[PDB]
Write an enzyme that holds these catalytic residues in place. Structure first.
Site, PDB file in Angstrom:
ATOM      1  N   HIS B 288     -12.742 -23.050  -3.603  1.00 46.23           N
ATOM      2  CA  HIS B 288     -12.123 -21.757  -3.314  1.00 46.23           C
ATOM      3  C   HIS B 288     -10.926 -21.894  -2.379  1.00 46.23           C
ATOM      4  CE1 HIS B 288     -15.098 -18.332  -4.446  1.00 46.23           C
ATOM      5  NE2 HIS B 288     -15.232 -19.331  -5.298  1.00 46.23           N
TER       6      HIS B 288
HETATM    7  C1  LIG Z   1      -4.803  -9.405  -4.027  1.00 42.36           C
HETATM    8  C2  LIG Z   1      -3.818 -10.062  -4.952  1.00 42.36           C
HETATM    9  C3  LIG Z   1      -4.468 -10.855  -6.045  1.00 42.36           C
HETATM   10  C4  LIG Z   1      -3.580 -11.836  -6.760  1.00 42.36           C
HETATM   11  C5  LIG Z   1      -4.287 -12.640  -7.821  1.00 42.36           C
HETATM   12  C6  LIG Z   1      -5.489 -13.404  -7.322  1.00 42.36           C
HETATM   13  C7  LIG Z   1      -5.200 -14.789  -6.775  1.00 42.36           C
HETATM   14  C8  LIG Z   1      -6.416 -15.620  -6.481  1.00 42.36           C
HETATM   15  C9  LIG Z   1      -7.511 -15.450  -7.484  1.00 42.36           C
HETATM   16  C10 LIG Z   1      -8.579 -16.187  -7.564  1.00 42.36           C
HETATM   17  C11 LIG Z   1      -8.876 -17.347  -6.668  1.00 42.36           C
HETATM   18  C12 LIG Z   1     -10.074 -18.132  -7.084  1.00 42.36           C
HETATM   19  C13 LIG Z   1     -11.336 -17.304  -7.258  1.00 42.36           C
HETATM   20  C14 LIG Z   1     -12.443 -18.054  -7.927  1.00 42.36           C
HETATM   21  C15 LIG Z   1     -12.606 -19.429  -7.384  1.00 42.36           C
HETATM   22  C16 LIG Z   1     -13.586 -20.286  -8.143  1.00 42.36           C
HETATM   23  C17 LIG Z   1     -12.974 -21.576  -8.534  1.00 42.36           C
HETATM   24  C18 LIG Z   1     -13.925 -22.744  -8.689  1.00 42.36           C
HETATM   25  O1  LIG Z   1     -15.120 -22.575  -8.391  1.00 42.36           O
HETATM   26  O2  LIG Z   1     -13.461 -23.812  -9.122  1.00 42.36           O
END
Ligand SMILES: CCCCCCCC/C=C\CCCCCCCC(=O)O
Ligand SMILES: CCCCCCCC/C=C\CCCCCCCC(=O)OC[C@H](COC(=O)CCCCCCC/C=C/CCCCCCCC)OC(=O)CCCCCCC/C=C\CCCCCCCC
Ligand SMILES: CCCCCCCC/C=C\CCCCCCCC(=O)OC[C@H](COC(=O)CCCCCCC/C=C/CCCCCCCC)OC(=O)CCCCCCC/C=C\CCCCCCCC
Ligand SMILES: CCCCCCCC/C=C\CCCCCCCC(=O)O
Lengths: 355, 355
Positions: B288
């Site tokens: 994350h």
């Molecule tokens: C508030 C603005 C939002 C913009 C788009 C979002 C940007 C980030 C989104 C997701 C980040 C990752 C969430 C999930 C992580 C799991 C990944 C893993 O386990 O490999």
């Protein structure tokens, strides 16, 4: 299986506003002050709640049309005429009580809702069979049973769970309080194109909480206390592909009251359109107009015309569900349910009551 | 079975704001302007999307540790050391690419997300079996397969439905545009006690739309184009009794990557707490923090500590779900997921990016 997104909606509308505790201003026992009925045992609401007890006497008439045996001073049109008369005075007496006696909103609403439910129960009792007895308290259980179909024979002989239903009552009172809070601080400041949707965004949540209060909470509490069985009282109406699909699964008691009005008891007339879309919805429009307009003590026929304008929406939305997808069908159901539908059918009367 | 309340949320957030048409100001092809990636094929995002192609070479290394048989110039710790090295350089190269090359947000986000997915796929190949061949393209199908478990043998020998998946792609682009609209006009004006919840109300809907975009729409499109089968890629996490229950059904690919990490392949250590709650979640915290903080180009360790402080929420909420009800447990899951959780774990980085 569980609620899921409903708890999300409850906690997010708790989190949006600043009243994170039940004491909003001062000395509030609940999360809102008592605004639904209030007052006390006074003469303002005295004849309205005493009229519902009077609605017990019309089943008591109807059994005395059928417990009177058919070779005993009654003939074949006479019993139907007595059934029509004891349903018509059953409708017409609480309307006169609510219109003559000036009172609040919710007392008239619950009296009129009880009148409509007792009427549907009476009509389902009157024409459901072939023609001192051994079943004299079957009508006194059907009166306080959720179904609107006679001779259920659904198993009452079961262990009543005094638990769960108590939790359900706590959920019921806290969600009625949440309904009151959303009404008081989301719709009441608005009253004195896109402004209609800005007015109608909180009342869709108010109707969602109403459906959660009545059909999932209250109707299961009623089916549990008298140990009916807690049966299917609705199906998944929230994913309605059409509004005609919405009407056949929002109310499984009313839909089984409709099957005698559509199928083999009423298949002797053989008409597709009026028997399903006009007069079966004229029934629902009459018992919407009585429920919403009589307690406001003004007759602008808006709930009746709302349901009767929702009648062409069945023909539009089934073809639009066939044309577009099941996604856009549900989106157009939610928009046509929000802006011109049952929540707005009480928004108009609330604006005319509070102004 | 269907979506239901998601279409209600989409149409009600369409109805709240005044942009009822796709032309908001002028010349807007979508319902929001192109704000996710924009630009063109320029040198700003050139090494970021060319690095993902480089992530193909690490499966191509790993097969050459296993297609090289263990009687051919490699011994038993050497193959494990090669596996560890080709996973560690696979993590550390896109981090250096994203940090050295200053670029946008979403290009770094998709590069780092691809890096994490390819890493989990690589670890689930290194230790999954007993010990020129007949299966040389199995790793090239597992690379673009949704699962994180090897030798699936799930039926690719089926007719690809070119329909539905196309509709799903249309739903995907329109919900990504709706995500961009909610981000642009609900969170961006806020940046320059209950104010935190007022800031965090739209990002919970943003995360809900992200989950609908990736796991229901994109992952079914991916499982359809290669005709994987559109398998169970999550279960009902929205009615999570606890966050510890949320983590086992939000991601059925990752959960089966955790089962080899917990059960009989990794049951030889016999520890209950660290093997399920700390080091099985240190993986999720690292991947994350690599996904949210590296694209923002500042290392405040907020997503890592957010997941690591979200770890004791499992121990609190399992006992609080045993204590209170399944209703109150879901409400406290939604509140603890809103204000201190995965949506706020990108809210902090978005506030630090746009200020
Ligand atoms: C508030 C603005 C939002 C913009 C788009 C979002 C940007 C980030 C989104 C997701 C980040 C990752 C969430 C999930 C992580 C799991 C990944 C893993 O386990 O490999
Ligand atoms: C000597 C002592 C004196 C004597 C003491 C005696 C007491 C006197 C009397 C009590 C009544 C008489 C009892 C006799 C009949 C019993 C019937 C009964 O009990 O229920 C049966 C029925 C349920 O009907 C209702 O409950 C409806 C009522 C609920 C309304 C709110 C009411 C709150 C209630 C009380 C408030 C009290 C609190 C303190 C205030 C006190 C101070 C003021 O179930 C069905 O069959 C239906 C299934 C089929 C569905 C039909 C279609 C679906 C329709 C609609 C969906 C929309 C609903 C929206 C809801 C609208 C409102 C937001
Ligand atoms: C000579 C010609 C040149 C050569 C031409 C070649 C092209 C070069 C390359 C292309 C890539 C390389 C392809 C190689 C690998 C293929 C892998 C693949 O295709 O998918 C496999 C994978 C899915 O992973 C993703 O898609 C993630 C990416 C999605 C992000 C958004 C991306 C938009 C995409 C494109 C934008 C382009 C648009 C135009 C802009 C162009 C101008 C800039 O499935 C799984 O296995 C996972 C199942 C397990 C779940 C794991 C845990 C769950 C984790 C998270 C949940 C949270 C998600 C939040 C979402 C984050 C965003 C808010
Ligand atoms: C906006 C303020 C809301 C106040 C509480 C709601 C008042 C009216 C509620 C419901 C009216 C009736 C709805 C259901 C009608 C069906 C009845 C029937 O078919 O017999």
């Amino acid at each position: 299986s569980h609620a899921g997104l409903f708890n999300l909606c409850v906690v997010v509308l708790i989190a949006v506003n600043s009243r994170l505790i039940i004491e909003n201003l001062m000395k509030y026992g609940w999360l809102i002050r008592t605004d639904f009925w209030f007052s006390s045992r006074s003469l303002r609401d005295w004849p309205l709640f005493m009229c519902c007890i009077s609605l017990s006497i019309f089943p008591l008439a109807a059994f005395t049309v059928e417990k009177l045996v058919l070779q005993k001073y009654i003939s074949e049109p006479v019993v139907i005429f007595l059934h029509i008369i004891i349903t018509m005075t059953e409708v017409l007496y609480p309307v006169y009580v609510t219109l003559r006696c000036d009172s609040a909103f919710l007392s008239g609403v619950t009296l009129m809702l009880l009148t409509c439910i007792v009427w549907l129960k009476l009509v389902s009792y009157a024409h459901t069979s072939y023609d001192y007895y051994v079943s004299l308290k079957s009508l006194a259980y059907f009166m306080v049973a959720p179904t609107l179909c006679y001779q259920p024979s659904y198993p009452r002989s079961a262990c009543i769970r005094k638990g769960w239903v108590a939790r359900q009552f706590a959920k019921l009172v806290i969600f009625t309080g949440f309904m009151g809070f959303i009404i008081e601080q989301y719709i009441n400041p608005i009253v004195r194109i896109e402004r209609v949707l800005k007015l109608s965004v909180p009342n869709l949540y108010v109707w969602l909480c109403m459906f959660y209060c009545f059909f999932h909470l209250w109707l299961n509490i009623l089916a549990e206390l008298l140990c009916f069985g807690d049966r299917e009282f609705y199906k998944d109406w929230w994913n309605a592909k059409s509004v005609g699909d919405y009407w056949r699964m929002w109310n499984m008691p009313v839909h089984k009251w409709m099957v005698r009005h559509i199928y083999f008891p009423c298949l002797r007339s053989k008409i597709p359109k009026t028997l399903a879309i006009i007069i079966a919805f004229l029934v629902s429009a009459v018992f919407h107009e009585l429920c919403i307009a009589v307690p406001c003590r003004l007759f602008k026929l808006w709930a009746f015309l709302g349901i009767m304008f929702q009648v062409p929406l069945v023909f539009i939305t089934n073809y639009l569900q066939e044309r577009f997808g099941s996604t856009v069908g549900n989106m157009i159901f939610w928009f046509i349910f929000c802006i011109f539908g049952q929540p707005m059918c009480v928004l108009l009367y609330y604006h005319d009551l509070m102004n």
